[model samples]
Target: NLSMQTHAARMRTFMYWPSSVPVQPEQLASAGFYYVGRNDDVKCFCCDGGLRCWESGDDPWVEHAKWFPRCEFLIRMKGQEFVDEIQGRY
Candidate 1:
């Protein structure tokens, strides 16, 4: 429950370009992702190894699914259980 909201909140943190001046996003909405300062330029919020250059026609969910499809976030029906599972797994 809260994790879904938490994930949304976490993703929202990087939902914009970092700057004191007003800025416009690089069309990240439909792409289903945002930039993470931590090497993961395009953080899919749904996976771990989703970092990739933002090239033209690069799809976020596609990259996420193709690269990190094992992420519980990419294949789930509930929220907290998914989050909880992520916290304690082998």
Candidate 2:
């Protein structure tokens, strides 16, 4: 789960596309995407994987133009607890 502020921002830019073409994970991950956490933290499973917490900042734009030549998409996931609930049912 994310803070209300983060969730709101995410919803605002939800499913924004630069061009008609679709963006893929390979494109984003290849260039080292940015997350909404501390600078030292490169990848946080909670935000990165669960909340789709990656954006195209100025640094990524100027630095890795080739990899992220276009806009990227967001991805969201339920935490492990949710997964456990489903497993418990089985």
Candidate 3:
């Protein structure tokens, strides 16, 4: 069953980060996130998050998971358009 209450609460924490921006792979590697592989276009990476690397394709939108800690404030300060753009909507 759909948990609307839980989802509504969780949506308050949703945020977006663009994947097209160049990230320092060495920094991520040094931080203990291993670079496993990339997509056909080399746009994304399959990473071991100090744990395991999933097969084949990496989830491009995964960084959004990290925004929850400050997502509400970001939306309030930057506005929805900024959030959408960060999520690669723009």
Candidate 4:
């Protein structure tokens, strides 16, 4: 079953986008986030953590780590080293 956990599945949501997003689809998908069909909004498959209001130069991995530090998907994908580094920013 190609579910939300799959990167290609999440990447598909970015197709046919009528609006622009600050971050690239691959970057977001790599970070375990899927587009929610809203204005630059996305959610994680594992933790279901949602994020929006993306700004230019915003790193999807960093934002995901910074905002949802407890997300299992983020930790597993990028490892706790990066997660902890981003979390320490605030």
The lDDT for every candidate, in the order shown, is 0.47, 0.31, 0.33, 0.81
Question: How well does model 1 score by local distance difference test?
Answer: 0.47
lDDT of 1 at 48: 38
Provide the clashing-pair count of each candidate structure: 0, 0, 0, 0
C-alpha lDDT (0 to 100) for residue 14 of candidate 1:
64
Report the Cα lDDT for residue 84, model 3.
74
Estimated TM-score per prediction?
0.45, 0.22, 0.24, 0.85
TM-score of 1: 0.45
lDDT of 4: 0.81
> Among all windows of ten consecutive residues in candidate 3, which has the lowest summed lDDT?
40-49
The list of candidate 2 runs beyond 4 A from truth reads: 1-5, 15-45, 50-82, 88-90
Query: Per-residue CA lDDT of candidate 3, range 14-60, in tens?
Result: 22312342543332332223232332112111222122322234332
lDDT of 3 at 74: 34
| Per-residue alpha-carbon lDDT of candidate 1 for residues 1-90, written as tens digits (9 for 90 to 100) | 133234444456564545432222333433345555553365545443446455556545454455555666555623444434554532
Give the root-mean-square deviation of each candidate in angstroms: 9.4, 13.6, 14.0, 2.4
At residue 16, candidate 1 shows an lDDT of 50
Best by TM-score: 4
Model 2 TM-score?
Answer: 0.22
| Clash pairs detected, candidate 3 | none
Q: Please, what's the RMSD in Å of model 3?
A: 14.0
lDDT of 2 by residue, 1-90 (tens): 343224333333323423322433334333334233432222222223322323544232232322222223211233334334434532
10 residues in a row with least lDDT, candidate 1: 21-30
